[PDB]
Amino acid sequence: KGSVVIVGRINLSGDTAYAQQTRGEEGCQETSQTGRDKNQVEGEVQIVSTATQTFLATSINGVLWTVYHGAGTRTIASPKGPVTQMYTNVDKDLVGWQAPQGSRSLTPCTCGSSDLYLVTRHADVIPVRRRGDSRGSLLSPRPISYLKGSSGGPLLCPAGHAVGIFRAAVCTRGVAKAVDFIPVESLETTMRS
Amino acid sequence: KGSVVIVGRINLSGDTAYAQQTRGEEGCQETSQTGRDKNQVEGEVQIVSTATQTFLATSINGVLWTVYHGAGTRTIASPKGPVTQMYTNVDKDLVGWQAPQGSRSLTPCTCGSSDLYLVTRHADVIPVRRRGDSRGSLLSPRPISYLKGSSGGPLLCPAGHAVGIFRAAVCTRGVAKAVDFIPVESLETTMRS
Amino acid sequence: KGSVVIVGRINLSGDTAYAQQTRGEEGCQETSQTGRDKNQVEGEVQIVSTATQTFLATSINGVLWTVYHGAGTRTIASPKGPVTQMYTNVDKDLVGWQAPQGSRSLTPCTCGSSDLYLVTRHADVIPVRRRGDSRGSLLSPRPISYLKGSSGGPLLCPAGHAVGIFRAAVCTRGVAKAVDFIPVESLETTMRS
Amino acid sequence: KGSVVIVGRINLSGDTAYAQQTRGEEGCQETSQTGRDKNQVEGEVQIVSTATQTFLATSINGVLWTVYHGAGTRTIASPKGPVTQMYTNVDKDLVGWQAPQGSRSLTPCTCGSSDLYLVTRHADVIPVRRRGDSRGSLLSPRPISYLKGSSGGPLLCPAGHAVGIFRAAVCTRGVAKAVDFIPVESLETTMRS
Numbered sequence: 001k002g003s004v005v006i007v008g009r010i011n012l013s014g015d016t017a018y019a020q021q022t023r024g025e026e027g028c029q030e031t032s033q034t035g036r037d038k039n040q041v042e043g044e045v046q047i048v049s050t051a052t053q054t055f056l057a058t059s060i061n062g063v064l065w066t067v068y069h070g071a072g073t074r075t076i077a078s079p080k081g082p083v084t085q086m087y088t089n090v091d092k093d094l095v096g097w098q099a100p101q102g103s104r105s106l107t108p109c110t111c112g113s114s115d116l117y118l119v120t121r122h123a124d125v126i127p128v129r130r131r132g133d134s135r136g137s138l139l140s141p142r143p144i145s146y147l148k149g150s151s152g153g154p155l156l157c158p159a160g161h162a163v164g165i166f167r168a169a170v171c172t173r174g175v176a177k178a179v180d181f182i183p184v185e186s187l188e189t190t191m192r193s
Numbered sequence: 194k195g196s197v198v199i200v201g202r203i204n205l206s207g208d209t210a211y212a213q214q215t216r217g218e219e220g221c222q223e224t225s226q227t228g229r230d231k232n233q234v235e236g237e238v239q240i241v242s243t244a245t246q247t248f249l250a251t252s253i254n255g256v257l258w259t260v261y262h263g264a265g266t267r268t269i270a271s272p273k274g275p276v277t278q279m280y281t282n283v284d285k286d287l288v289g290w291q292a293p294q295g296s297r298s299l300t301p302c303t304c305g306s307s308d309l310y311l312v313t314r315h316a317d318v319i320p321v322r323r324r325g326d327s328r329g330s331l332l333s334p335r336p337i338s339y340l341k342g343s344s345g346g347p348l349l350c351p352a353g354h355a356v357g358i359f360r361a362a363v364c365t366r367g368v369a370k371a372v373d374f375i376p377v378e379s380l381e382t383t384m385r386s
Numbered sequence: 387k388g389s390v391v392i393v394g395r396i397n398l399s400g401d402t403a404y405a406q407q408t409r410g411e412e413g414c415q416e417t418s419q420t421g422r423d424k425n426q427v428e429g430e431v432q433i434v435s436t437a438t439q440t441f442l443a444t445s446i447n448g449v450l451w452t453v454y455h456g457a458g459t460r461t462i463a464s465p466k467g468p469v470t471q472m473y474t475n476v477d478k479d480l481v482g483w484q485a486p487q488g489s490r491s492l493t494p495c496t497c498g499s500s501d502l503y504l505v506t507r508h509a510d511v512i513p514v515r516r517r518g519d520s521r522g523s524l525l526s527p528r529p530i531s532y533l534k535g536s537s538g539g540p541l542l543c544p545a546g547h548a549v550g551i552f553r554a555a556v557c558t559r560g561v562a563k564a565v566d567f568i569p570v571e572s573l574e575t576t577m578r579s
Numbered sequence: 580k581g582s583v584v585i586v587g588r589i590n591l592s593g594d595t596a597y598a599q600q601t602r603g604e605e606g607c608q609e610t611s612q613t614g615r616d617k618n619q620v621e622g623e624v625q626i627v628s629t630a631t632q633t634f635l636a637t638s639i640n641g642v643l644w645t646v647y648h649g650a651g652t653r654t655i656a657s658p659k660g661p662v663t664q665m666y667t668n669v670d671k672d673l674v675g676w677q678a679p680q681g682s683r684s685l686t687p688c689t690c691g692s693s694d695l696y697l698v699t700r701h702a703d704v705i706p707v708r709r710r711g712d713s714r715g716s717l718l719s720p721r722p723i724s725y726l727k728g729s730s731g732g733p734l735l736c737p738a739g740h741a742v743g744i745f746r747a748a749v750c751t752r753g754v755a756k757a758v759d760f761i762p763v764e765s766l767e768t769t770m771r772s
């Protein structure tokens with residue numbers, strides 16, 4: 001098994017969020033095996049991939065978090081070679097690596113707001129009403145293709161702070177009505193499992 | 194000068210560590226003066242307090258260990274009244290009392306692992322790369338307030354064995370970059386100061 | 387993508403349940419490629435495999451039912467070539483093919499019993515107390531390895547009727563304490579998705 | 580929290596250093612509460628005290644410097660009421676107030692001398708060989724009691740110029756073998772923490 005590769009990024013700093021590709025199919029193949037990635041890293045959300053899957057990863061408090069169902073126990077490619085996981089929990093579906101040099105960490109939310117915004121891999125930032133610790137209902141139901149590939153992405157408060165990590169979607173006939181996420185308070189309190 | 198009192202504990206059994214409060218400021222002030230504590234004790238990591246300071250204490254091999262800079266020469270409040278220290282060393286900054294009945298002891302690490310996890314008073318479990326015999330660097334540096342009050346707490350290995358006791362932080366720019374700790378092998382080998 | 391292949395089965399006819407291997411890693415690869423499998427079929431529960439994963443499949447009312455997270459949109463290998471799916475529902479994590487000739491089908495439960503039994507790929511048939519329509523608690527909590535590769539397997543009532551199809555395990559620190567299943571009343575009522 | 584109070588001084592003017600007490604426990608307690616101290620100030624090294632601790636404070640370039648581990652963020656009692664700190668750094672363990680009227684400031688050393696002299700609260704002037712920027716070894720090792728209550732005190736060169744402020748002692752078996760100090764070049768260059 002190879003390393004997880006940063007193949008793009010979601011820029012959240014301007015008036016309009018945008019996704020940008022940094023690596024194609026050809027570039028991602030040898031980067032995965034060597035674990036060496038010389039590409040300059042920028043932003044809060046990275047678009048990441050393995051050999052069979054594409055998903056997101058979010059830098060919060062100097063840690064780049066993602067889902068175990070995407071990254072497995074894999075390292076991530078960096079300029080100084082493959083980077084091992086700081087956090088690994090299969091039961092929570094969570095992994096984390098030291099945030100890459102040049103990345104911009106989101107700050108954890110203490111607002112207690114129920115007005116959330118989910119960031120997708122297509123840079124859509126959509127409202128989610130918080131319905132519990134790890135649940136949120138979408139204000140507008142979406143087809144599965146709209147959310148697929150966006151696990152490991154963040155849930156933000158109206159002030160742009162990180163509230164959680166997108167894990168799973170509540171679905172009915174190819175349509176998502178709610179989301180399941182790992183709350184920010186459950187990140188650095190994670191035990192190895 | 195009163196006793197050190199157990200005011201809470203860190204629960205390490207789940208996928209998420211959590212802090213539990215067992216006593217408020219009034220009961221801590223009181224129990225500190227009398228040294229009598231009838232409360233059910235559980236787990237490995239205790240949250241402890243004197244009349245003026247709060248820190249951690251860790252059970253390893255039937256001994257509850259902590260820092261001298263926190264506990265001084267003080268007794269520990271217990272069901273049978275104040276319990277005197279079995280280990281006291283000002284130079285090492287270490288103290289220990291017989292572990293409270295019902296407490297669970299961590300087993301010392303026999304891994305040789307250099308991937309450590311520091312447990313804070315806020316139930317944060319942060320990765321530390323073992324650098325020296327008594328040193329480790331944070332994989333992701335943290336503000337002081339994040340590590341403050343966590344002296345006497347444990348440095349665990351990936352398997353959850355004890356590797357050392359948190360003593361001091363290597364701070365620059367109001368940020369802890371590295372930690373200083375008493376290694377497990379240096380605990381039972383302690384002489385009286 | 388190739389076909390789903392029967393690689394063995396779970397015989398529940400006698401006093402003691404037993405698993406039998408009928409195909410190996412090479413034969414499974416060749417059968418996945420051709421979609422033609424002339425091997426004899428017998429029993430309720432089939433041990434099935436793709437090129438990368440292995441799980442269970444249960445015949446209920448002439449349909450061989452399994453999980454989408456295992457089978458995907460894949461056809462099943464048969465003596466007359468690749469068999470296309472009759473039920474495909476991503477949201478329910480359910481797939482179904484016409485049961486292969488030689489298979490025995492379970493009958494749906496109408497007993498109303500809350501005393502369930504889950505059948506594993508290792509032929510263990512373990513008690514599960516029903517909590518809701520799709521949930522049950524394990525009477526003995528189990529390591530993840532004990533249940534992994536058993537999705538698509540059945541939940542039985544004390545009279546041996548089909549109660550549901552094992553889908554997911556409620557896990558904490560590598561231990562499953564409860565199970566999530568697709569109830570029998572949710573099988574034939576399934577829509578395409 | 581009350582004021583840090585001058586409770587005496589070290590006279591370094593004759594052939595033999597001496598310590599003079601100017602206030603007793605009752606006066607220090609009353610002067611700490613009001614923050615008003617009408618007493619005459621003389622010399623370079625003051626004996627200072629809070630409600631609980633006693634230590635030293637040294638005037639260098641019109642600033643009375645001491646350790647944060649003794650003074651904290653506290654004001655100093657003066658003829659015109661409480662005087663606030665102009666220098667406060669937890670990381671360096673340094674504080675500084677405007678030197679009191681009547682104090683005599685030491686001048687920073689520019690000898691480059693490696694032969695230092697540490698001044699204790701008991702007026703002992705003991706040789707220290709400089710080893711690095713912030714370290715010196717004792718020519719004759721000492722019991723801890725000899726050095727305790729002398730943080731904030733000066734390290735002088737053979738010519739009587741200020742080289743550093745005494746911070747910590749390198750201790751083994753109730754004996755100090757070396758000293759850790761804040762160099763004079765690190766005093767005015769101090770940023771707030």
Ligand SMILES: CC[C@@H]1C[C@H](C)CC/C=C\[C@@H]2C[C@@]2(C(=O)NS(=O)(=O)C2(C)CC2)NC(=O)[C@@H]2C[C@@H](Oc3nccc4cc(OC)c(F)cc34)CN2C(=O)[C@H]1NC(=O)OC(C)(C)C(F)(F)F
Pocket residue numbers: 053054055056069070091092093144147148149150151166167168169170171179180476477478479
């Ligand atoms: C069946 C409906 C859902 C799957 C759809 C096909 C996809 C929905 C779209 C996006 C989802 C965020 C999105 C995505 O984007 N993934 S991705 O980037 O594409 C991928 C595969 C890595 C490359 N996640 C999924 O598809 C996930 C993957 C799978 O669930 C899980 N697997 C493993 C461990 C989990 C642990 C959990 O709790 C501890 C847990 F809640 C779910 C776990 C399954 N999963 C889901 O999101 C599924 N929803 C789901 O399982 O929901 C439940 C039952 C957990 C619910 F309703 F309670 F939340």
Ligand SMILES: CC[C@@H]1C[C@H](C)CC/C=C\[C@@H]2C[C@@]2(C(=O)NS(=O)(=O)C2(C)CC2)NC(=O)[C@@H]2C[C@@H](Oc3nccc4cc(OC)c(F)cc34)CN2C(=O)[C@H]1NC(=O)OC(C)(C)C(F)(F)F
Pocket residue numbers: 246247248249262263264284285286337340341342343344359360361362363364372373669670671672
């Ligand atoms: C100045 C920067 C540090 C203080 C910050 C204000 C706080 C850092 C946060 C947490 C530290 C673990 C934390 C905490 O949490 N404490 S607490 O629970 O709050 C408390 C006071 C009991 C109630 N410990 C400290 O703050 C400690 C206390 C003080 O150092 C020491 N005092 C006494 C004896 C020591 C003996 C030693 O070796 C033989 C030693 F290395 C340090 C000793 C001081 N101390 C420290 O941690 C300090 N770091 C420090 O002294 O570092 C050195 C110089 C020893 C280093 F860099 F080499 F490691």
Ligand SMILES: CC[C@@H]1C[C@H](C)CC/C=C\[C@@H]2C[C@@]2(C(=O)NS(=O)(=O)C2(C)CC2)NC(=O)[C@@H]2C[C@@H](Oc3nccc4cc(OC)c(F)cc34)CN2C(=O)[C@H]1NC(=O)OC(C)(C)C(F)(F)F
Pocket residue numbers: 090091092093439440441442453455456457477478479530533534535536537552553554555556557565566
């Ligand atoms: C995180 C802990 C669980 C994963 C462990 C690593 C393994 C547990 C062991 C056995 C589970 C039955 C076992 C197995 O055997 N699989 S297998 O045969 O090995 C395989 C991969 C096909 C070859 N299933 C899993 O591992 C499943 C796979 C994954 O969940 C799911 N993915 C896709 C769609 C799902 C739709 C759902 O509802 C509509 C749903 F509830 C779960 C879905 C993930 N999954 C799970 O069982 C996970 N539990 C889980 O997701 O549970 C929740 C959150 C739905 C719970 F707790 F609410 F039930």
Ligand SMILES: CC[C@@H]1C[C@H](C)CC/C=C\[C@@H]2C[C@@]2(C(=O)NS(=O)(=O)C2(C)CC2)NC(=O)[C@@H]2C[C@@H](Oc3nccc4cc(OC)c(F)cc34)CN2C(=O)[C@H]1NC(=O)OC(C)(C)C(F)(F)F
Pocket residue numbers: 283284285286632633634635646648649650670671672723726727728729730745746747748749750758759
């Ligand atoms: C464990 C041995 C030492 C404590 C002994 C019980 C006493 C030694 C005697 C005198 C020391 C100068 C004497 C004294 O006199 N103090 S006092 O006037 O009594 C007081 C408490 C204010 C009222 N200072 C101490 O006791 C000091 C206090 C404590 O260390 C420290 N706390 C806070 C911040 C520090 C920052 C540092 O660097 C960034 C640092 F190196 C040490 C820090 C702790 N401290 C020390 O001097 C301790 N030594 C120590 O921490 O040494 C190290 C590990 C930093 C060393 F060896 F590297 F220098």
Ligand SMILES: [Zn+2]
Pocket residue numbers: 108109110111112113157158159160161
């Ligand atoms: Zn917020």
Ligand SMILES: [Zn+2]
Pocket residue numbers: 301302303304305306350351352353354
């Ligand atoms: Zn270990």
Ligand SMILES: [Zn+2]
Pocket residue numbers: 494495496497498499543544545546547
């Ligand atoms: Zn029945």
Ligand SMILES: [Zn+2]
Pocket residue numbers: 688689690691692736737738739740
């Ligand atoms: Zn000089």
